[PDB]
Amino acid sequence: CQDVVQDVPNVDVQMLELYDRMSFKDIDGGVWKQGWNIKYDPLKYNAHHKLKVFVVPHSHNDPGWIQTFEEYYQHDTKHILSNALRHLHDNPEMKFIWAEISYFARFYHDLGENKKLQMKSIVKNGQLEFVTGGWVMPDEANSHWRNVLLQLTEGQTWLKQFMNVTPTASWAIDPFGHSPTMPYILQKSGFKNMLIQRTHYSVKKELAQQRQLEFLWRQIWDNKGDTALFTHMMPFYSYDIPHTCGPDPKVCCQFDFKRMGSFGLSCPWKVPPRTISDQNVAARSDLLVDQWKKKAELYRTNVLLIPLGDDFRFKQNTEWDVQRVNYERLFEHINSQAHFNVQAQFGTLQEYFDAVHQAERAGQAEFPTLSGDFFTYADRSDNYWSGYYTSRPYHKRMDRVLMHYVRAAEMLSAWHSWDGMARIEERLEQARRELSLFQHHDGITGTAKTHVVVDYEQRMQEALKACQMVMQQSVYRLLTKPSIYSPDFSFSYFTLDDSRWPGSGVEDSRTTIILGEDILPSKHVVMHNTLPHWREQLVDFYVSSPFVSVTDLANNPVEAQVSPVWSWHHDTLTKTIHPQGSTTKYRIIFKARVPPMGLATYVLTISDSKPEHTSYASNLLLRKNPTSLPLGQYPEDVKFGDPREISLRVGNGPTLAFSEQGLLKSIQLTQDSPHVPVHFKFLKYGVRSHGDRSGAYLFLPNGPASPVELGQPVVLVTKGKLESSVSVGLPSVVHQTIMRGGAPEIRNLVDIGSLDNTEIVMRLETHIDSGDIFYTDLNGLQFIKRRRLDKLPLQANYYPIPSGMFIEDANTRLTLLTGQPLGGSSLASGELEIMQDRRLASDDERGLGQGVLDNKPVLHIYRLVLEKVNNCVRPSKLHPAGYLTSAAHKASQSLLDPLDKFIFAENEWIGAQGQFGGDHPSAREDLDVSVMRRLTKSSAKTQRVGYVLHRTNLMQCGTPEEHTQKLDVCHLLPNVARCERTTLTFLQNLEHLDGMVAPEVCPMETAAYVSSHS
Ligand SMILES: O=C1N[C@@H]2[C@@H](O)[C@@H](O)[C@H](O)[C@@H](CO)N2C1=O
Ligand SMILES: CC(=O)N[C@@H]1[C@@H](O)[C@H](O)[C@@H](CO)O[C@H]1O
Ligand SMILES: [Zn+2]
């Protein structure tokens, strides 16, 4: 295993270092506004060294943006694809590339057999080529690597089955910034080449000047280079035709033949395109070839890539003709005029890459190596796209919840082969596809129109229902005596109970377990643990009585804690935000111990009085002029008091101190240790009255944030043996700090209401000597070192916080883990801040046509970990990466993949069993079975189950952490006949594993295996 901590990779271009050196000056470079006047030696080419030009026709189709997926399909895409089939069939030399498989699949299944055969033929002959082959062209900032792989697999699996092809070249022309997580996954999925476009204009200029636009992109910790994937970065401002033929858009626009009038399009540079004729082809070619030759000066080979397309292009038949015939005339002239020394033709992306590498092997070019990412993107001036790291936070949080339900549903149902009548495969396919669709760069990014966001939400809601159905049917089968099991595939044996989504204060949807002497004395509940190691975790349920006790299936009592059900209300009358307690609903909390990738059953029983093993939390409402708070049967009376600082400590864990406004002020790890200053504070950012306005994409603050006026907020303190908390009703936010014995959990019920042109940020102020350094993660896969640059505006220092961020000095580190992707940064030494929500009144001129005024209450969740790290073996100062500690990683897992809770629906569960998976290996803490999915339907003689195994890297800080069993995924199911290592998409076998054993992976490595069973 390569060491991912101690060896600083030696690369030609390291983005953090590059950023440190760059001046980022935004000067007018001429026709190429953000570049310079490119010059080339005409004698560079001759009959012995020609310029090979590949014009690649394409059509960018958004699976939702200003119209819904289905709306675009009916209005544009089905026509584009139908005419593409016709035109490519009739013109053998014409080419076309396609990226979004969600649309292709939607179109394909509506075709007759005659057309399906014609389609298979033009793909087979190379005219129609799929690039990337994912369900969508995913966002690369907010997306979790697990979902990026999910959507890639959904698209490629469909392609292999129906088109018999698997793309090895990726095309990403629209994501707003790019992440190294992509080459990571692609390289492990058979890819050999990739292309990106949206990168900071300053970076494009810098790399173009050194001809480093094509590079071998390796991971920041990879010293050997085995993760390297050849990458091509386009050099200009856009992927449209005016910005892809050469440096001068005024000239290139003349070669977009759809802009002549009848199509309702024109050239903003004022010179229209002109139909090519024998009388002007020489002058036209001279202009075009000159553009090509200038673009060619930016690359290292004599092979040039010229994309030809734009949004939803190549729709009308007349459009196909106008682009094809005119370019055909240019090619004939150019290719026959020796003095040009050019050979131009229509081609595909793979053809371009193949030619480049043939040149490379001929020794005409040596490519540079590069590590780092391409955030935060800016397309012009100070317009940085850091706003979408937070836009529509409700759906960003929903993405993470569905991510987990999909994993749990596929895993729980994978243990058995199911009858088609169970509709398991059906429901799972829908769930995977709806979540996959949302990975689109206008989905999770929060940059779509309001009705399109509603469509995505509806689709995800259906996906959640689908996973619940599969999950509960699975639990019933896994925990019911075989000879008793009698399933009704349409029946709900269990109901999922989720305490954090939509969340308290967002939607009152969780069911209360109703117990009563005259109705039902007890109820069975089941917990599921998707993680490959034993796990204990407090779980809670709503019960109709406070006198409830818990036991496991062996009837052993389990220590429990009952607390009231508190809900906050903005009191329209008194004009205050205060809590109300339930008088008929209570929360029971207890620790559930669940096997690796397994299940554990518990029983809740009612009694007339306080049961021996159940304690009751105390409650303190702090504020002036309080009123009574009755709680029905609740044993203890609520206490009151004037606002005052308070301190709490659950178990033998950390001691937390709070201000009189209910906000964290300090943390004391041990009774010896000092009270470390850790202050939570809420501030607001505004919008400029002059210049450009912030919108769904852009973050253009009107200076540093200003503190939110808190007034005298009401604070509620709940103190219990197992769980305690401090909640405060602040303007726009009900802030809660929960303590269960270890790292505290933070929950924010965010309701920005009608506060227009306001962005709410949560900041942590400490004394940590972090300087200008901080760390943020990329797609929940790796942590990259960031350096605050004062030479760049505030918004440029904001980065995606998909799962976590941290700051540290020689001895102390503060890590904030998130349960949803949001934007954040460290604007000053010792600080950390993350945006909660943003309501913007205007459009930010990027095509959306609206501001963001559809905010809705959302429950954001986090874990705050303060740790001493002076004893940890950390990377040297020059290393571009950072790594979490064991505690921080486990805290992240508690947020992203919590235990699942099921409540038995009926009154009696006959044949109920107490546990499943007790014999499953409890793997090392840094190892995870990211995906478990049965790949075969019941009718297959040889059953196949695929597994994706990921091992992160945790810092060694002096903790013995030992005794754990080896996990061999290939033996998790009986009767294994063979074990093979496959690409991450399970589509290609790479190794036949001897002994049928799947070996564990190295730190930061990800592997996929498929076990076959007879
Ligand atoms: O013409 C445009 N093309 C891209 C779209 O494809 C869309 O997904 C982007 O959000 C949006 C970002 O500006 N886009 C445009 O305005
Ligand atoms: C779809 C089909 O049956 N056609 C075959 C395919 O099975 C085979 O894998 C491929 C090799 O690339 O050659 C095609 O002609
Ligand atoms: Zn797009």
CSV table of C-alpha atoms in Angstrom, one decimal, residues 121-406:
chain,number,residue,atom,x,y,z
A,121,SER,CA,-26.2,0.3,-36.0
A,122,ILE,CA,-25.1,3.9,-36.0
A,123,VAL,CA,-23.6,3.4,-32.5
A,124,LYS,CA,-21.9,0.2,-33.6
A,125,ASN,CA,-20.4,1.9,-36.7
A,126,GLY,CA,-19.1,4.8,-34.7
A,127,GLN,CA,-21.3,7.7,-35.9
A,128,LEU,CA,-23.1,8.2,-32.6
A,129,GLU,CA,-20.8,8.0,-29.7
A,130,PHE,CA,-21.6,8.2,-26.0
A,131,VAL,CA,-19.4,10.3,-23.8
A,132,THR,CA,-19.2,9.5,-20.1
A,133,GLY,CA,-22.4,7.5,-20.2
A,134,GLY,CA,-23.8,8.6,-16.9
A,135,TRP,CA,-27.5,9.1,-16.2
A,136,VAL,CA,-26.6,12.8,-16.1
A,137,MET,CA,-23.6,15.2,-16.2
A,138,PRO,CA,-23.3,15.6,-12.4
A,139,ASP,CA,-22.5,18.6,-10.3
A,140,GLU,CA,-19.0,18.1,-8.9
A,141,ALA,CA,-19.2,20.4,-5.9
A,142,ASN,CA,-22.2,19.2,-3.8
A,143,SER,CA,-22.4,15.6,-5.0
A,144,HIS,CA,-21.3,12.8,-2.8
A,145,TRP,CA,-18.9,10.4,-4.5
A,146,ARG,CA,-21.3,7.5,-3.7
A,147,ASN,CA,-24.0,9.2,-5.8
A,148,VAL,CA,-21.6,10.2,-8.6
A,149,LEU,CA,-20.8,6.4,-8.9
A,150,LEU,CA,-24.5,5.5,-8.6
A,151,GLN,CA,-25.5,7.7,-11.5
A,152,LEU,CA,-22.5,6.6,-13.6
A,153,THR,CA,-23.4,3.0,-13.0
A,154,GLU,CA,-27.1,3.6,-13.8
A,155,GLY,CA,-26.2,5.1,-17.2
A,156,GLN,CA,-23.4,2.7,-18.2
A,157,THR,CA,-25.3,-0.4,-17.1
A,158,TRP,CA,-28.1,0.7,-19.4
A,159,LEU,CA,-25.7,1.3,-22.2
A,160,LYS,CA,-24.0,-2.1,-21.9
A,161,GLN,CA,-27.4,-3.9,-21.9
A,162,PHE,CA,-29.0,-2.0,-24.8
A,163,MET,CA,-26.2,-0.5,-26.9
A,164,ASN,CA,-23.4,-2.9,-26.1
A,165,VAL,CA,-20.9,-0.2,-25.4
A,166,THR,CA,-19.0,1.3,-22.4
A,167,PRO,CA,-17.6,4.8,-22.8
A,168,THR,CA,-13.9,5.2,-21.9
A,169,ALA,CA,-13.9,9.0,-22.5
A,170,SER,CA,-15.7,11.5,-20.3
A,171,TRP,CA,-17.3,14.8,-21.4
A,172,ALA,CA,-18.1,17.4,-18.7
A,173,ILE,CA,-18.6,20.8,-20.3
A,174,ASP,CA,-21.1,22.4,-17.8
A,175,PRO,CA,-20.5,21.6,-14.1
A,176,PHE,CA,-19.6,24.9,-12.3
A,177,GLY,CA,-16.0,23.9,-11.3
A,178,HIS,CA,-14.4,20.5,-11.4
A,179,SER,CA,-13.3,17.9,-8.7
A,180,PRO,CA,-10.6,15.3,-8.8
A,181,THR,CA,-13.2,12.9,-7.5
A,182,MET,CA,-14.2,12.5,-11.1
A,183,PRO,CA,-11.0,11.1,-12.5
A,184,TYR,CA,-10.7,9.0,-9.3
A,185,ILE,CA,-14.0,7.2,-10.0
A,186,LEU,CA,-13.6,7.2,-13.8
A,187,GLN,CA,-10.1,5.7,-13.7
A,188,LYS,CA,-11.4,3.0,-11.5
A,189,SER,CA,-14.3,2.4,-13.9
A,190,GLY,CA,-12.3,1.7,-17.1
A,191,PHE,CA,-11.8,5.3,-18.4
A,192,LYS,CA,-8.8,6.5,-20.2
A,193,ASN,CA,-9.6,10.1,-21.0
A,194,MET,CA,-11.7,13.0,-19.7
A,195,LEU,CA,-12.6,16.6,-20.7
A,196,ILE,CA,-13.6,19.6,-18.6
A,197,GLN,CA,-14.5,23.2,-19.3
A,198,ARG,CA,-15.7,25.4,-16.5
A,199,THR,CA,-12.5,26.5,-14.7
A,200,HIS,CA,-11.4,30.0,-13.5
A,201,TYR,CA,-10.5,32.2,-16.5
A,202,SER,CA,-7.2,33.0,-14.8
A,203,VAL,CA,-6.3,29.3,-14.6
A,204,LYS,CA,-7.2,28.9,-18.3
A,205,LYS,CA,-4.8,31.7,-19.2
A,206,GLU,CA,-2.0,30.4,-16.9
A,207,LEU,CA,-2.1,26.9,-18.2
A,208,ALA,CA,-2.6,27.9,-21.8
A,209,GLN,CA,0.6,30.0,-21.6
A,210,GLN,CA,2.6,26.9,-20.5
A,211,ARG,CA,0.6,24.5,-22.8
A,212,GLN,CA,-0.6,22.6,-19.7
A,213,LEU,CA,-4.3,22.4,-20.7
A,214,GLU,CA,-3.9,18.7,-21.3
A,215,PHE,CA,-2.4,16.8,-18.3
A,216,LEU,CA,-2.3,13.6,-16.3
A,217,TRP,CA,-4.6,14.3,-13.4
A,218,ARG,CA,-3.6,12.3,-10.3
A,219,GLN,CA,-5.0,12.5,-6.8
A,220,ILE,CA,-3.2,14.9,-4.4
A,221,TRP,CA,-1.8,12.1,-2.2
A,222,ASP,CA,-0.7,9.8,-5.1
A,223,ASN,CA,3.1,9.8,-5.2
A,224,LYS,CA,3.4,7.0,-7.7
A,225,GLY,CA,0.7,8.2,-10.2
A,226,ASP,CA,-1.4,5.1,-10.6
A,227,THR,CA,-4.6,7.2,-10.2
A,228,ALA,CA,-3.6,9.4,-13.2
A,229,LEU,CA,-6.2,10.0,-15.9
A,230,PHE,CA,-5.4,12.0,-19.1
A,231,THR,CA,-7.4,15.2,-19.0
A,232,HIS,CA,-8.2,17.9,-21.6
A,233,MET,CA,-9.3,21.3,-20.3
A,234,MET,CA,-11.0,23.5,-23.0
A,235,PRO,CA,-9.3,26.9,-23.2
A,236,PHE,CA,-12.1,29.4,-23.6
A,237,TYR,CA,-15.0,31.1,-21.9
A,238,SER,CA,-17.8,28.8,-23.2
A,239,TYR,CA,-18.5,25.5,-24.9
A,240,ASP,CA,-20.8,27.2,-27.5
A,241,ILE,CA,-19.6,27.6,-31.1
A,242,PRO,CA,-18.4,31.2,-30.7
A,243,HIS,CA,-15.9,30.1,-28.0
A,244,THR,CA,-14.7,26.7,-29.4
A,245,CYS,CA,-13.3,27.4,-32.9
A,246,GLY,CA,-10.6,29.8,-31.8
A,247,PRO,CA,-9.7,32.8,-29.6
A,248,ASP,CA,-12.0,35.3,-31.5
A,249,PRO,CA,-15.7,34.8,-30.9
A,250,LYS,CA,-16.6,37.5,-33.5
A,251,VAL,CA,-15.0,35.2,-36.1
A,252,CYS,CA,-16.1,31.9,-34.7
A,253,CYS,CA,-19.7,33.0,-34.4
A,254,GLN,CA,-19.7,33.2,-38.2
A,255,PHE,CA,-19.3,29.5,-38.3
A,256,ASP,CA,-22.4,28.7,-36.3
A,257,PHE,CA,-24.7,28.3,-39.2
A,258,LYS,CA,-27.9,28.2,-37.1
A,259,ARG,CA,-27.5,31.9,-36.5
A,260,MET,CA,-28.7,33.4,-39.8
A,261,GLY,CA,-32.2,34.6,-39.0
A,262,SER,CA,-34.9,32.0,-39.6
A,263,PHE,CA,-33.9,30.2,-36.4
A,264,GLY,CA,-34.3,33.4,-34.3
A,265,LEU,CA,-30.6,33.5,-33.4
A,266,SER,CA,-27.9,36.0,-34.3
A,267,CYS,CA,-24.3,36.9,-33.5
A,268,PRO,CA,-23.8,39.5,-30.7
A,269,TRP,CA,-20.5,40.5,-32.3
A,270,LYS,CA,-22.5,41.8,-35.2
A,271,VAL,CA,-21.1,39.8,-38.1
A,272,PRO,CA,-23.5,37.1,-39.2
A,273,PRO,CA,-22.6,33.7,-40.5
A,274,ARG,CA,-22.6,33.4,-44.3
A,275,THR,CA,-23.7,30.4,-46.4
A,276,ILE,CA,-20.5,28.9,-47.8
A,277,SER,CA,-20.3,29.0,-51.6
A,278,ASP,CA,-17.6,28.4,-54.2
A,279,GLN,CA,-17.2,32.2,-54.3
A,280,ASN,CA,-16.4,32.7,-50.7
A,281,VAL,CA,-15.1,29.4,-49.4
A,282,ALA,CA,-11.5,30.4,-49.9
A,283,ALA,CA,-11.9,33.6,-47.7
A,284,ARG,CA,-14.1,31.7,-45.2
A,285,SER,CA,-11.6,28.9,-44.9
A,286,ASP,CA,-8.7,31.4,-44.5
A,287,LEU,CA,-10.6,32.9,-41.5
A,288,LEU,CA,-11.5,29.6,-40.0
A,289,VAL,CA,-8.1,27.8,-40.5
A,290,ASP,CA,-6.4,30.8,-38.8
A,291,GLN,CA,-8.6,30.4,-35.8
A,292,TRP,CA,-7.9,26.7,-35.6
A,293,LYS,CA,-4.1,27.3,-35.9
A,294,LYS,CA,-4.3,29.8,-33.1
A,295,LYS,CA,-6.2,27.4,-30.8
A,296,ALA,CA,-3.6,24.7,-31.8
A,297,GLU,CA,-0.8,26.9,-30.3
A,298,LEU,CA,-2.2,26.2,-26.9
A,299,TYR,CA,-1.7,22.5,-27.1
A,300,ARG,CA,1.2,20.1,-27.4
A,301,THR,CA,0.3,18.0,-30.4
A,302,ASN,CA,-0.8,18.5,-34.0
A,303,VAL,CA,-4.3,17.1,-33.2
A,304,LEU,CA,-7.0,19.7,-32.5
A,305,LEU,CA,-10.4,19.3,-30.9
A,306,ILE,CA,-13.1,21.6,-32.1
A,307,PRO,CA,-16.5,21.1,-30.4
A,308,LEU,CA,-19.5,22.0,-32.5
A,309,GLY,CA,-22.7,22.6,-30.5
A,310,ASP,CA,-24.7,24.4,-27.8
A,311,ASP,CA,-27.8,23.9,-25.6
A,312,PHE,CA,-30.3,21.6,-27.1
A,313,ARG,CA,-28.8,21.9,-30.6
A,314,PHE,CA,-29.4,19.8,-33.6
A,315,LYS,CA,-33.1,19.7,-33.2
A,316,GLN,CA,-34.7,20.7,-36.5
A,317,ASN,CA,-33.9,18.9,-39.8
A,318,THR,CA,-33.0,22.2,-41.4
A,319,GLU,CA,-30.4,22.8,-38.6
A,320,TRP,CA,-28.7,19.5,-39.3
A,321,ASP,CA,-28.5,20.4,-42.9
A,322,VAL,CA,-27.3,23.9,-42.5
A,323,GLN,CA,-24.5,22.9,-40.2
A,324,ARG,CA,-23.5,19.7,-42.1
A,325,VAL,CA,-23.6,21.0,-45.7
A,326,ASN,CA,-21.7,24.2,-44.9
A,327,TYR,CA,-19.0,22.4,-42.9
A,328,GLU,CA,-18.7,19.8,-45.7
A,329,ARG,CA,-17.9,22.6,-48.2
A,330,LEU,CA,-15.2,24.0,-45.8
A,331,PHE,CA,-13.6,20.6,-45.4
A,332,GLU,CA,-13.5,19.9,-49.1
A,333,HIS,CA,-11.8,23.2,-49.8
A,334,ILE,CA,-9.5,23.2,-46.8
A,335,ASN,CA,-8.4,19.5,-47.3
A,336,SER,CA,-7.6,20.0,-51.0
A,337,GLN,CA,-5.6,23.2,-50.6
A,338,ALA,CA,-2.1,22.0,-49.8
A,339,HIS,CA,-1.0,25.4,-48.6
A,340,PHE,CA,-3.2,24.9,-45.5
A,341,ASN,CA,-1.5,21.7,-44.4
A,342,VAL,CA,-4.7,20.7,-42.6
A,343,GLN,CA,-6.9,17.7,-42.7
A,344,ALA,CA,-10.3,18.5,-41.1
A,345,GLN,CA,-13.3,16.2,-40.6
A,346,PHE,CA,-16.2,15.4,-38.3
A,347,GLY,CA,-15.2,13.2,-35.5
A,348,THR,CA,-16.0,11.9,-32.1
A,349,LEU,CA,-14.4,12.5,-28.7
A,350,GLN,CA,-12.7,9.1,-28.6
A,351,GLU,CA,-11.3,9.7,-32.0
A,352,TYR,CA,-9.7,12.9,-30.9
A,353,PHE,CA,-8.1,11.3,-27.8
A,354,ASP,CA,-6.9,8.2,-29.8
A,355,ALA,CA,-5.2,10.6,-32.3
A,356,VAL,CA,-3.5,12.6,-29.5
A,357,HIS,CA,-2.1,9.5,-27.9
A,358,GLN,CA,-0.9,8.2,-31.2
A,359,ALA,CA,1.0,11.5,-31.6
A,360,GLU,CA,2.3,11.1,-28.0
A,361,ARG,CA,3.5,7.6,-28.7
A,362,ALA,CA,5.3,8.9,-31.9
A,363,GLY,CA,7.2,11.0,-29.4
A,364,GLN,CA,5.8,14.4,-30.5
A,365,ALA,CA,4.6,15.3,-27.1
A,366,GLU,CA,5.2,14.8,-23.3
A,367,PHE,CA,2.3,15.7,-21.0
A,368,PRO,CA,2.6,17.4,-17.6
A,369,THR,CA,1.3,15.9,-14.3
A,370,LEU,CA,-1.2,17.7,-12.1
A,371,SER,CA,-3.0,17.4,-8.8
A,372,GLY,CA,-5.6,19.6,-7.1
A,373,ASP,CA,-9.1,20.7,-7.9
A,374,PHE,CA,-10.8,23.5,-9.8
A,375,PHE,CA,-13.0,25.4,-7.3
A,376,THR,CA,-14.0,28.0,-6.9
A,377,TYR,CA,-15.0,28.8,-10.5
A,378,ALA,CA,-15.3,32.4,-11.9
A,379,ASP,CA,-16.3,32.9,-15.5
A,380,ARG,CA,-15.5,36.7,-15.5
A,381,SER,CA,-14.3,39.5,-13.3
A,382,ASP,CA,-15.2,38.9,-9.6
A,383,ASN,CA,-18.2,36.7,-10.4
A,384,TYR,CA,-17.4,33.6,-8.4
A,385,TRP,CA,-19.9,30.7,-8.4
A,386,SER,CA,-19.9,29.9,-4.7
A,387,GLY,CA,-23.6,30.7,-4.2
A,388,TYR,CA,-24.8,27.3,-5.5
A,389,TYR,CA,-22.8,25.6,-2.8
A,390,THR,CA,-25.8,26.6,-0.6
A,391,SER,CA,-28.8,27.3,-2.9
A,392,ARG,CA,-32.0,25.4,-2.1
A,393,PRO,CA,-30.5,23.8,1.0
A,394,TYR,CA,-33.7,21.8,1.6
A,395,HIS,CA,-33.1,19.6,-1.4
A,396,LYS,CA,-29.3,19.4,-0.7
A,397,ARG,CA,-30.2,17.8,2.7
A,398,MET,CA,-32.8,15.6,1.0
A,399,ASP,CA,-30.1,14.3,-1.3
A,400,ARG,CA,-28.1,13.0,1.6
A,401,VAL,CA,-31.1,11.3,3.2
A,402,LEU,CA,-32.1,9.6,0.0
A,403,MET,CA,-28.4,8.6,-0.6
A,404,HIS,CA,-28.6,6.6,2.6
A,405,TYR,CA,-32.1,5.1,2.0
A,406,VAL,CA,-31.0,3.9,-1.4
